With several copies, the nearest count.
Chain A
Amino acid sequence: TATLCLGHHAVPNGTLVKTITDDQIEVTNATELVQSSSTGKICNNPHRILDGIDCTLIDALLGDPHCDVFQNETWDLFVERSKAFSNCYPYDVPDYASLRSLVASSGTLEFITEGFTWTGVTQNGGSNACKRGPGSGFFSRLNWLTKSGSTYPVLNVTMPNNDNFDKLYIWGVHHPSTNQEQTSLYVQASGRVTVSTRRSQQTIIPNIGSRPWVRGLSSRISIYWTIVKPGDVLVINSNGNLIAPRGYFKMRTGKSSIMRSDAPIDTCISECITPNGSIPNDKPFQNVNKITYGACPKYVKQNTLKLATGMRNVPEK
């Protein structure tokens, strides 16, 4: 006679996995399905990464003197840093978060200057709170209009959209610290700014008073925006406190976004970006972050998941 024995391989040291019927079963091999680490750096390929160094996207949009390098810049991902700071005339943006989202998803700061004509007013006013070069200045994409001589007319300007794309207009309203400023700056006891299209309008009333001092100023500027579609018309009506647009930003649709991260950017390639740096995307899940951009693994709570890649390991003994 003869003996024919059937069997399978085993390994000296296997690994444990979980099944429906068993909490821990040893298997010959298992792989890891959760990516739990990053390189600590953001890769600059294949996506276009724009490091706002000390700028926020809104300061870059408005034209803060330290952000002059971002004029007409584009990105797939705009990266904000914790060290970013503003250094211009103090301002606020009602619904800041929406404007930040609109610009971030458009993906561009391409700006086209338009021939707005403002008559009977002094154009291009600035402040020592926004120095540009050795003297006073202002945001590069805004025009601070003030009285001319002894008057300030009601401004009524029309700017039609005869193009085949949407135009984004950024404008604002000045808020003087006192009654003695508003009548020396734009000779008006009660200003108003109205900006409208064929479908909607926004009217803003300025609010006089001292705020905490920021960069030497107790006054503020509020930022507002409007979108004009092809065939529509932009109309601006004001009797004081207008921080006029100088033109429009071209709007786009696409894959562009924004992230907050202090990670450095390097010469490597990775499709998945998290605020902790780029991660591999060769696993179905990750627990590095919830904030991701690009071709990323799904975020899960688990730090580890082991998937058997082989059979039960039963040692010889």
Chain B
Amino acid sequence: AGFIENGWEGMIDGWYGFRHQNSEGTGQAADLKSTQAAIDQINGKLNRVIEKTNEKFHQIEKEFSEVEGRIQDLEKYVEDTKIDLWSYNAELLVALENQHTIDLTDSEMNKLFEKTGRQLRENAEDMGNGCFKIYHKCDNACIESIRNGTYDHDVYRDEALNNRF
């Protein structure tokens, strides 16, 4: 895909979208449904989904000015144990969350692509670069019909198949 080859530095009205070329020239528009879906999943994740702030008050002493022996050794041990475990949880959690963010945003891109491909049916071919070659004249009203989910492939097959085969 074209979305593997690169992203668009020129797209500022959304995260995912369409770019096109036809007889009326070129243009661009964001897809707001996939943009919002990716955003909602992320905003949820950045919030307190599996963790929250706990309020704590009186606790053990963590710093000492004197050498005491066994009790102090245990208090230090307990605190170091707690820190190592929370530091671990923080590494694993961030790597898992980042792994899921990359995967959900790549998936939203692929979903838009498959969604488009099945709307077009046999009237278009996948060029291997994130683009569909549409085999019939498709003007700006047509491109918007594809973009908003109303493209009717049955009014184009007679032309599109003649151009494909």
Contacts and interface: CB of A to CB of B under 8 A. Distances in A.
A242 interface: no
Interface string B124-165: 100101111111111000110010000000000000000100
A33 to B, nearest CB: 7
B69 A311 contact: no
A312 interface: yes
A227 B66 CA distance: 9
A292 to B, nearest CB: 7
Interface of B: 1-9, 11-12, 14-23, 38, 41-42, 44-46, 49-51, 53-59, 61-63, 66-70, 73, 79, 83-84, 86-87, 90-91, 94-102, 104-106, 109, 112-113, 116, 124, 127, 129-138, 142-143, 146, 163
Contacts of A315: 6-7, 9
A20 B58 contact: no
A294 B98 contact: no
Contacts of B124: 4
A295 B54 CA distance: 6
Given A4-B131, A21-B104, A257 B59 contact: yes
A273 to B, nearest CB: 11
Contact of A292 (B45, B56, B130): B56
A6 B59 contact: no
A34 B86 CA distance: 12
Interface of A: 1-12, 17-23, 25, 27-28, 31, 33-34, 95, 97-99, 101-102, 104-105, 166, 227, 251, 254-258, 260, 271, 281, 284-285, 290-302, 305-317
A33 B98 contact: no
Given A9-B12, A310-B101, A3 B134 contact: yes
B77 to A, nearest CB: 11
B8 A308 contact: no
Contacts of B100: 20-21
Given A4-B146, A316-B8, A308 B101 contact: yes
A19 B58 contact: no
A33 B95 CA distance: 12
B98 A3 contact: no
A3 B62 contact: no
A102 B67 contact: yes
A166 B65 CA distance: 12
A20 B96 contact: yes
B60 to A, nearest CB: 9
Given A11-B9, A311-B38, A316-B8, A290 B45 contact: no
Nearest to A10: B7
Contact of A20 (B17, B73, B84, B99): B99
Nearest to B68: A98
B57 to A, nearest CB: 4
A258 B133 CA distance: 71
B131 A296 contact: no
